[PDB]
From a paper:
The severe fever with thrombocytopenia syndrome virus (SFTSV) is a tick-borne human-infecting bunyavirus, which utilizes two envelope glycoproteins, Gn and Gc, to enter host cells.
The ectodomains of Gn and Gc tightly pack together as a heterodimer, which further assembles into pentameric (penton) and hexameric (hexon) peplomers projecting from the viral envelope. In each virion, there are 12 pentons sitting at the icosahedral vertices, and 110 hexons covering the facets, giving a total of 720 Gn/Gc heterodimers in each virion. Superposition of the 12 Gn/Gc heterodimers within an asymmetric unit (ASU) shows that the conformations of the ectodomains are quite consistent while the TM regions display noticeably different orientations. Structural clustering of the 12 quasi-equivalent Gn/Gc conformers revealed three clusters, with the 11 hexonal heterodimers clustering into two closely related groups, and the one in pentons being most distant from the others. The assembly of penton and hexon peplomers are mainly mediated by interactions in the ectodomains which form an ordered contacting network to stabilize the icosahedral glycoprotein shell. Exemplified by the penton-hexon interface, the outer sheet of Gc domain III in the penton adheres to the end loops of the Ig-like domain C of hexon Gn, which is the most prevalent interactions between individual peplomers.
Residue numbers in the entry:
A (entry chain E): 358 to 476, 480 to 510
B (entry chain J): 561 to 1069
C (entry chain I): 818 to 868
D (entry chain K): 767 to 817
Write the structure that this text describes.
Amino acid sequence: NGGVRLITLTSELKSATVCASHFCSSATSGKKSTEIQFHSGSLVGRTAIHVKGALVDGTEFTFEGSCMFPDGCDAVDCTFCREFLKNPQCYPAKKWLFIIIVILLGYAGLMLLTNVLKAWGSWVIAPVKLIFAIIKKLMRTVSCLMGKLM
Amino acid sequence: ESCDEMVHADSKLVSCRQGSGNMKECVTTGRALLPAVNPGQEACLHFTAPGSPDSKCLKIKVKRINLKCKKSSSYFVPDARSRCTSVRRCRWAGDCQSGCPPHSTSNSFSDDWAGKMDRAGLGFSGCSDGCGGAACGCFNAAPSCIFWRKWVENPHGIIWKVSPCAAWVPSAVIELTMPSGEVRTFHPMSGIPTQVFKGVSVTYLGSDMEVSGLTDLCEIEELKSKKLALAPCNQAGMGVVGKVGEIQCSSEESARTIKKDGCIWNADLVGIELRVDDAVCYSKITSVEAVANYSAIPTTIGGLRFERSHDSLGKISGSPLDITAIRGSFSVNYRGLRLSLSEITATCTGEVTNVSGCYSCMTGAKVSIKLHSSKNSTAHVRCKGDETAFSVLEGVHSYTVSLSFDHAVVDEQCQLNCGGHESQVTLKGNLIFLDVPKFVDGSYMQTYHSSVPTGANIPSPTDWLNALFGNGLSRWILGVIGVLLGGLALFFLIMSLFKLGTKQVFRSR
Amino acid sequence: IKKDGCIWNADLVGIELRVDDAVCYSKITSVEAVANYSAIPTTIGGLRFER
Amino acid sequence: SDMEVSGLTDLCEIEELKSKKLALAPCNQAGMGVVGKVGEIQCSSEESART
Ligand SMILES: *[C@@H]1O[C@H](CO)[C@@H](O)[C@H](O)[C@H]1NC(C)=O
Ligand SMILES: *[C@@H]1O[C@H](CO)[C@@H](O)[C@H](O)[C@H]1NC(C)=O
Ligand SMILES: *[C@@H]1O[C@H](CO)[C@@H](O)[C@H](O)[C@H]1NC(C)=O
Ligand SMILES: *[C@@H]1O[C@H](CO)[C@@H](O)[C@H](O)[C@H]1NC(C)=O
């Protein structure tokens, strides 16, 4: 499920490199049954495994194999593969619930906004500073008139 | 496998003749350019002749793109020991009156030393003084001439191969297949000729990637035990004592023996010490595991993970995390080659059988095409969106190729033509979408990563919300109405439940 | 490119060898390789260099 | 372990043969020497020291 596994019967594994369709990996530990993985969900479809390496005492080995990998398996929860994939739907009962929750949130937001739309506002706040500026101009004109009278 | 990135740069550029009687060619010369491809792809080079309907192609296979360096020089550094001998004699004549060398005589060999051998090696004809008297071996109050000769040996015979380099330019492997049928491999460099074979001079180009801590590194390797290590090595013959760069020689056969005529040493590599007619020699040569910054086969200095890739002409590699380099295009030049053309193509017609793959992604979508004809390989598929060329065999067989599509529901009509005959094909199937894979612990990159498609990154309203309701031609409205009614019913139910909960919370406190 | 008329100073072609190969690499750059390489239509500054 | 020294810069191991007397004092170098300190008229062997 995780990846491919290399089995050695002659001797231990010194170093080896595996190849895939569009990916490559290399790992070595020194045991008989070694496991080598590429990524999470990188091999999806029909591909051929081409392993090439050399064992101890200067002995090289080459093998070819084609393994059956699952195609319709996404296994995502909070990534971009959720909002873009709808054909396989590995977890069914989900899109209906998501759309229902979105509709509920939209209706709740609309109901909360209507309470303010129908019923302490800018149209009351602005006349305050407007009349303040008017009173400032009136005081300036009064000072100018006093200066003119002097 | 599949093919892409067609060029067709020098079509109809032949000056041939009747061609041995029925149909032959002479030479084709031009110049083209191949763009960068993902590791594990094929770049076909389809030629076009004015007389022949179709021609063969030239596939380029790339497997790994490792970070190697050039080869500034090559030499072998053998292991040496301390060997020396001396002789105690008396004056007894006028040969040892005052000193051993009168003014400049360095030939301190009176046809008695063992220096005239093939296994002796490098040495320095030096001399010193000894003791005199009845206890030292003489019978006259006069100094005695005592000569000494030292050299180096190699009992074991360990051979080392060092190759200094300070460039570290990107490189890759190319498995080229000629249209005639010959398949060979070679390792091109980033601007260095790759030993042009029958005119083909395909080279690789990089991007001059900087290094973090790669200033003084080499690729010293061992032959017997096949042990590799990363450590700063020396330079050419003009070197300094104190680090790597001890007594070397010219060839590998000159490494087992440390004899002259090929071995080079500057000075001060073996010392001499004596107290009383002893002339003992001590060793100052350091082994390979003695200098600083001596790494091993697994090296993780910086972001690069230097591994040991099994490959000819080089055993040094390394691959960091996904880099997604800018460009890795090639440059192919032709000088002279022959290619046979049939020009006897007959009626051929194929069809599509299967279709599958990813979305517009790395591996693409593979489509199986079946053909049937008498000619060996005369086919050229051309369609919108992507162009793919491949080779077939005689008779009826099955072939699988990959194309690039930009739509989930691939339902179009492409044109297929083999040789001179043409036909029409159709594709119908369902595709999926795969993004860039994520990193997992325990896994390390092997060669490199080319590119990952992450352009759109947005949900498409056409593909999304498709299998939720259904498919038809007038049932979509009914489905939308039913879903809306169910949503309104569930909304009313949830509102009633919330009102009941608030009523229960308010009273009965 | 024969002698008696052709002039070159030094260090215009490199040599590399590993095992009785003596391969040579190219360092000569073409005309479209240096900086500030213009074309037939040139509008550098107020001058419009035509042909 | 290459242990460092505190004040050991110019020291020697001059020893006497007849009386077997030892002393620590800075001595001279090879034949090319300077007059003013130890390093006076020397010779090659021990028998060449009596004369
Ligand atoms: C070893 O590497 C370090 C860091 O790059 C450097 O400072 C040091 O000089 C190196 N040592 C030698 C002997 O080159
Ligand atoms: C086409 O049909 C299925 C579809 O995937 C495939 O498994 C099968 O191998 C193909 N047919 C042949 C003859 O290869
Ligand atoms: C076609 O292929 C067969 C078998 O590979 C070979 O014997 C024959 O010569 C080929 N013909 C041409 C024209 O290439
Ligand atoms: C190109 O022109 C600019 C501005 O005139 C100058 O700074 C630069 O040095 C030039 N480049 C070369 C290679 O001469």
